[PDB]
Amino acid sequence: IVGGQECKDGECPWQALLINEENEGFCGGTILSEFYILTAAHCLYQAKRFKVRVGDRNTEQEEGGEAVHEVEVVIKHNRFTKETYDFDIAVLRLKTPITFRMNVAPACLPERDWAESTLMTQKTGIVSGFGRTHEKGRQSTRLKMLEVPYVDRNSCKLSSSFIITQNMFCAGYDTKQEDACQGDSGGPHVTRFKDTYFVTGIVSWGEGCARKGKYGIYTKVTAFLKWIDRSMKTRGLP
Amino acid sequence: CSPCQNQGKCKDEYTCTCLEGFEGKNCELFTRKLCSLDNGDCDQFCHEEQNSVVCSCARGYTLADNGKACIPTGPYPCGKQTLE
Numbered sequence: 001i002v003g004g005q006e007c008k009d010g011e012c013p014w015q016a017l018l019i020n021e022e023n024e025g026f027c028g029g030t031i032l033s034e035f036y037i038l039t040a041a042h043c044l045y046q047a048k049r050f051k052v053r054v055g056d057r058n059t060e061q062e063e064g065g066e067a068v069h070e071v072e073v074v075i076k077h078n079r080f081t082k083e084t085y086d087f088d089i090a091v092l093r094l095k096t097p098i099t100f101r102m103n104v105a106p107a108c109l110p111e112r113d114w115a116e117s118t119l120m121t122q123k124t125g126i127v128s129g130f131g132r133t134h135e136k137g138r139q140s141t142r143l144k145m146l147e148v149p150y151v152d153r154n155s156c157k158l159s160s161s162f163i164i165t166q167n168m169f170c171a172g173y174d175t176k177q178e179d180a181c182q183g184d185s186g187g188p189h190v191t192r193f194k195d196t197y198f199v200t201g202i203v204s205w206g207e208g209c210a211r212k213g214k215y216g217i218y219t220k221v222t223a224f225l226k227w228i229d230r231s232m233k234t235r236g237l238p
Numbered sequence: 239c240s241p242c243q244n245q246g247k248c249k250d251e252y253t254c255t256c257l258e259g260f261e262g263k264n265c266e267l268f269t270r271k272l273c274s275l276d277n278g279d280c281d282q283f284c285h286e287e288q289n290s291v292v293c294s295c296a297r298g299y300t301l302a303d304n305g306k307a308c309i310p311t312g313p314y315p316c317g318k319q320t321l322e
């Protein structure tokens with residue numbers, strides 16, 4: 001996260017962190033329930049082995065409260081497209097249940113039509129992650145959040161050097177030095193309604209971090225609510 | 239007392255006792271609204287059903303018997319920052 005603030009205790013409980021072979025975080029994720037994590041499809045290709053840590057607020061200190069879970073089943077969207085990052089979404093089923101606690105809690109999946117009318121029409125959303133705090137900088141050891149404005153689609157497309165499909169949306173600032181960054185990818189974008197936080201995006205891509213005339217590109221979760229449920233309905237093995 | 243609206247009752251200033259479906263000092267405002275306004279007074283999801291509003295809730299909540307509020311089923315319902 002570029003700009004924004006560090007997360008206080010229990011402020012971003014749905015944040016997950018994908019850690020590679022070297023116990024190193026490389027992508028974010030969102031807790032959907034005790035068994036499912038939501039992340040970006042492209043993150044799957046960025047580590048040979050990976051697990052999921054929850055409840056981490058500082059990576060430097062094993063402050064307790066952290067918990068690491070094995071992935072039992074990786075459910076990648078089959079339509080994920082490497083050149084465009086269209087369908088940049090995936091669900092992970094965990095081998096063992098997440099125990100909810102302080103700093104460890106699921107974000108809400110919204111009904112589609114309602115979220116179209118009620119969430120995507122709000123001014124801002126929140127994105128969070130352990131990503132670089134500077135494009136030329138270094139991955140944060142501490143969980144950060146950042147309020148980001150919704151950018152109307154036309155603005156979004158025309159600001160962009162690359163194809164913005166209908167399965168994506170723009171969020172962030174034109175010139176202000178606040179944006180998501182490398183490392184945040186796969187992480188949560190949520191939208192508040194009456195003190196409840198709903199999943200509305202996944203951190204996907206962008207042309208640098210906080211560059212003038214550029215926004216962060218997010219996977220539009222409303223487009224995939226139906227797909228997320230079908231992937232979660234499977235539950236555990238037969 | 240004629241100030242009251244929508245056939246509400248005016249009891250002498252004054253006070254208005256409205257019929258069901260109306261509110262406001264003069265019963266000049268409709269209570270029955272669609273999701274487009276005040277989210278139909280639902281705490282969470284709102285969706286229409288025969289020009290009628292029907293509220294629902296996310297996972298691990300249950301719809302209060304009043305058909306509008308959402309009742310958690312535990313200490314860690316979805317979408318809530320953890321207090322403890």
Ligand SMILES: COC(=O)/C(C#N)=C(\Nc1cccc2c(Cl)c[nH]c12)N[C@H]1CCCCN(CC(=O)N2CCCC2)C1=O
Pocket residue numbers: 082083084085132134135136162179180181182183184185203204205206207208209210215216217218
């Ligand atoms: C320090 O540099 C960075 O952090 C760079 C760079 N540069 C960066 N930031 C970054 C990554 C992920 C999300 C966001 C958001 Cl939200 C704002 N910034 C983000 N992302 C890069 C990562 C390298 C590959 C290029 N790429 C993918 C891409 O261009 N496309 C176009 C269509 C298909 C995908 C990128 O997304």
Ligand SMILES: [Ca+2]
Pocket residue numbers: 056057058059060061062063066
């Ligand atoms: Ca740690």
Ligand code: NA
Pocket residue numbers: 173174175176177178179210211212213214215
């Ligand atoms: Na910017």
